[PDB]
């Protein structure tokens, strides 16, 4: 009868997620199903691979189990795979397969050929406000989805946002994502993007993702982040100071949104008030945003990356290639049993 509400949409998303969260997929391919092509980025690396049976290209993240244990990232890695195999949203990268062998963990994701937002942003300098707003709207919807599932993302940055062939965003790298009701305490993220309450060891919640969205919007529109220095400790001093300076070319609407996202008092921060995400979606800076049309991916993108065919990596930097060595002895089997 009545059309579906946002609440009903999100309830449907939660039921779909919980089924996969409670019964995760495991061991759905193996290494010799793929041909290794090239390293796309770098406890491991991500490689462009080609699936032998289908000819499909994928991005294969390879994690050295011994390095994960040594870096004390076991539980974070289990979080990453358990969450990524259970989520489903138009702006989240799709995990196609996962498996492990004696030496490594493998997560095989859809190949997003347009390159990192980071690369395009640094090259062009800064995005126009309409361009930044188009990307920001996708992140707003993605966090609405993730947070409704009790997921905190915790590593938003242009390096983790890949541009697809339609010009839309695919969020990658769930290495710090965590399903939590209430607060958590891990000092993790990327220095420029840390909310003050992470730095101050206070305990924190999903409001850190909305702070990070403020950092991302600022960096997209300015071409540099709101708090930068040569060493992280100086970045942290600026973050907790409560002071932000804005480029003169920032619109008044953009500055007002950013003062409310880069709000050091998490109890006054947009996204964390009684109206939740709707304080952000209804803000004047987003007045031209058709949220349904963004979700449906029917808005024309500010640009489409160059594409020379399948397997083309011209939108990615070159990295040193290193052989994938698999030991004859199983490493760290107990630790990664559920992977």
């Amino acid at each position: 009868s009545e059309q579906e509400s946002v609440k009903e949409f999100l309830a449907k998303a939660k039921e779909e997620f919980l089924k996969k969260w409670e019964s995760p997929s495991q061991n759905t391919a193996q290494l010799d199903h793929f041909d290794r092509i090239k390293t796309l980025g770098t406890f491991g690396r991500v490689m462009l691979v080609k699936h032998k049976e289908t000819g499909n290209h994928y991005a294969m993240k390879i994690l050295d189990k011994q390095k994960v244990v040594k870096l004390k990232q076991i539980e974070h890695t289990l979080n990453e795979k358990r969450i990524l195999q259970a989520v489903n949203f138009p702006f989240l990268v799709k995990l196609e397969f996962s498996f492990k062998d004696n030496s490594n963990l493998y997560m095989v994701m859809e190949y997003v050929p347009g390159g990192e937002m980071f690369s395009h942003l640094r090259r062009i300098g800064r995005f126009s406000e309409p361009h930044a707003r188009f990307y920001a709207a996708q992140i707003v919807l993605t966090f609405e989805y993730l947070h409704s599932l009790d997921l905190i993302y915790r590593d938003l940055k242009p390096e983790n946002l890949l541009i697809d062939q339609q010009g839309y965003i695919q969020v990658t790298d769930f290495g710090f994502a965590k399903r939590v009701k209430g607060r958590t305490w891990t000092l993790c993220g990327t220095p420029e993007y840390l909310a003050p309450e992470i730095i101050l060891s206070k305990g924190y919640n999903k409001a850190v993702d909305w702070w990070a969205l403020g950092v991302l919007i600022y960096e997209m529109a300015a071409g540099y982040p709101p708090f930068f220095a040569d060493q992280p400790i100086q970045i942290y001093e600026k973050i907790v100071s409560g002071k932000v300076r804005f480029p003169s070319h920032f619109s008044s609407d953009l500055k007002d949104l950013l003062r409310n996202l880069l709000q050091v008092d998490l109890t006054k921060r947009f996204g964390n008030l009684k109206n939740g995400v709707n304080d952000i979606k209804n803000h004047k800076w987003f007045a031209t945003t058709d949220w349904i049309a963004i979700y449906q991916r029917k808005v024309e993108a500010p640009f489409i990356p160059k594409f020379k065919g399948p397997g083309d990596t011209s939108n990615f930097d070159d990295y040193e290639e290193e052989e994938i060595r698999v030991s004859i002895n199983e490493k760290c089997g107990k630790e990664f049993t559920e992977f």
Binding site: E159, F176, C188
Partner: peptide, 19 residues
């Protein structure tokens, strides 16, 4: 300019996570 100070800084490349 703030832009010039950023471009001369040591953190204009890909930023590693911390933990």
């Amino acid at each position: 300019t703030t832009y010039a100070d950023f471009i001369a800084s040591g953190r204009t490349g890909r930023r590693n996570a911390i933990h």
